[PDB]
Amino acid sequence: TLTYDDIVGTGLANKCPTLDDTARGAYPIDSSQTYRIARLCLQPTTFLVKEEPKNKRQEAEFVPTKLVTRETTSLDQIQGELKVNSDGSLTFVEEDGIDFQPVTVQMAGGERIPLLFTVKN
Amino acid sequence: GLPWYRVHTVLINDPGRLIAAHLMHTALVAGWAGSMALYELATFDPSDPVL
Numbered sequence: 001t002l003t004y005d006d007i008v009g010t011g012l013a014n015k016c017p018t019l020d021d022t023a024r025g026a027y028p029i030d031s032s033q034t035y036r037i038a039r040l041c042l043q044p045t046t047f048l049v050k051e052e053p054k055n056k057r058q059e060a061e062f063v064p065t066k067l068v069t070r071e072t073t074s075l076d077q078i079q080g081e082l083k084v085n086s087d088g089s090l091t092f093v094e095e096d097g098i099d100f101q102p103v104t105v106q107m108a109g110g111e112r113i114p115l116l117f118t119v120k121n
Numbered sequence: 122g123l124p125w126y127r128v129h130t131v132l133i134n135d136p137g138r139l140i141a142a143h144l145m146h147t148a149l150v151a152g153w154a155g156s157m158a159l160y161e162l163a164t165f166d167p168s169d170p171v172l
């Protein structure tokens with residue numbers, strides 16, 4: 001249970017919360033209640049970019065890249081409705097939050113690939 | 122004086138300056154190799170070893 005001052009500059013602020021190995025339970029859904037996701041967090045650990053080879057024939061592969069914009073990549077504080085559908089499926093409908101990060105990664109050889117890493121809407 | 126095509130003969134009796142002239146030749150050749158590689162790296166397209 002840490003304060004800002006414990007965290008500032010460690011890199012921990014770009015990390016999503018985790019759960020212990022013991023958290024293998026079950027969260028009951030009461031078809032009668034209304035639900036929300038009060039916090040969604042997404043922390044990327046890998047960016048892959050599909051190569052664009054010279055002849056379409058040979059499937060192009062996603063290859064690893066180097067992040068050049070530092071620990072600024074996570075999506076967080078995202079919230080919204082968690083609907084219970086006729087068939088008992090749940091539907092998350094994002095309303096708001098820090099739901100995008102610009103990110104630049106670099107291909108082998110140096111080509112930079114900016115992207116708007118997002119789950120908007 | 123020495124004709125133009127004999128100027129380097131001043132080194133024949135001078136082991137120290139011969140070694141200096143050799144070192145310089147060696148400096149030029151290693152410098153070539155270095156420069157040649159950088160020019161190749163600045164122009165080489167590594168994106169297709171097939172075609």
Ligand code: CLA
Nearest residue numbers: 123124125126127128129130131132133142143146149150
């Ligand atoms: C390791 C190889 C080597 C070395 C160390 C020498 C060294 C020497 N040579 Mg010999 N020679 C060689 C190979 C070599 N030669 C080869 C391959 C040939 C046939 C092409 C000759 C034909 C030759 C003749 C006919 C004579 C010599 C002479 C000499 C002496 C004076 C050179 C001088 O003052 O030139 C001064 C040269 C200049 C001021 C300008 C030369 C410019 C050249 C022609 C063009 C530009 C060259 C360019 C920078 C080359 C890059 C080199 C690389 C591609 C190989 C000196 C002892 C002379 C001698 O015996 O003196 C008593 C003499 O008359 N050489």
Ligand code: CLA
Nearest residue numbers: 123125127128129130131132138141142143144145146149
């Ligand atoms: C490996 C190359 C090399 C080395 C180690 C030597 C070493 C020596 N030379 Mg020789 N020489 C060379 C090549 C070399 N020379 C070439 C290519 C020429 C024809 C220009 C000569 C013509 C020459 C003369 C006429 C004399 C010597 C003499 C001598 C001695 C004294 C230094 C001097 O006066 O240089 C003078 C030579 C130069 C300064 C070479 C000029 C440089 C050329 C033009 C290239 C320019 C370099 C530049 C950075 C790149 C251009 C790039 C381009 C895209 C524009 C010493 C033994 C002197 C002496 O001892 O005689 C008894 C003397 O009088 N040299």
Ligand code: CLA
Nearest residue numbers: 135136137138139140141142143144145146147148150151
């Ligand atoms: C153990 C004794 C010893 C060793 C290790 C060498 C080794 C060498 N000699 Mg020889 N030489 C020797 C005895 C020795 N020599 C004696 C007793 C004589 C009579 C005086 C000669 C006369 C002689 C002449 C006239 C020449 C050589 C040259 C060379 C060099 C040719 C290759 C070169 O330039 O590669 C490329 C070089 C490298 C990759 C760098 C190597 C790292 C160096 C050695 C470290 C330098 C620091 C060290 C403290 C300086 C002293 C070095 C000296 C012992 C060679 C090479 C370094 C030639 C030369 O120097 O051309 C440039 C040359 O012209 N030698």
Ligand code: CLA
Nearest residue numbers: 126127128129130142145146147148149150151152153154
């Ligand atoms: C085994 C490999 C090898 C050998 C044996 C040599 C040997 C030689 N080099 Mg070195 N050289 C090498 C590799 C080698 N080189 C490499 C890899 C580089 C980097 C490109 C060089 C760069 C270099 C430079 C910059 C110089 C030398 C010079 C020399 C000569 C110095 C001794 C001399 O006075 O000759 C006297 C000269 C001769 C006997 C005439 C050699 C004629 C050659 C073989 C043909 C030249 C073709 C044509 C006439 C020139 C047109 C060029 C023009 C279109 C630009 C000698 C012939 C120096 C020299 O020639 O000083 C005058 C000189 O300046 N070399």
Ligand SMILES: CC1=C(/C=C/C(C)=C/C=C/C(C)=C/C=C/C=C(C)/C=C/C=C(C)/C=C/C2=C(C)CCCC2(C)C)C(C)(C)CCC1
Nearest residue numbers: 145146147148149150151152153154155156157158159160
């Ligand atoms: C000093 C110093 C330094 C630096 C160095 C450098 C930077 C160098 C460079 C160098 C270089 C950069 C060099 C170069 C060289 C080159 C050469 C030597 C060339 C030659 C050429 C030729 C010889 C040619 C011929 C021909 C022609 C022209 C045409 C065709 C035919 C033929 C091929 C014949 C350092 C910092 C490290 C440290 C220590 C000190």
Ligand SMILES: CCCCCCCS[C@@H]1O[C@H](CO)[C@@H](O)[C@H](O)[C@H]1O
Nearest residue numbers: 108109110111159161162163165167
């Ligand atoms: C003395 C050599 C120092 C210079 C090194 C230049 C960086 S290395 C250089 O980087 C480029 C882009 O990342 C690549 O396209 C290229 O293939 C590579 O050679």
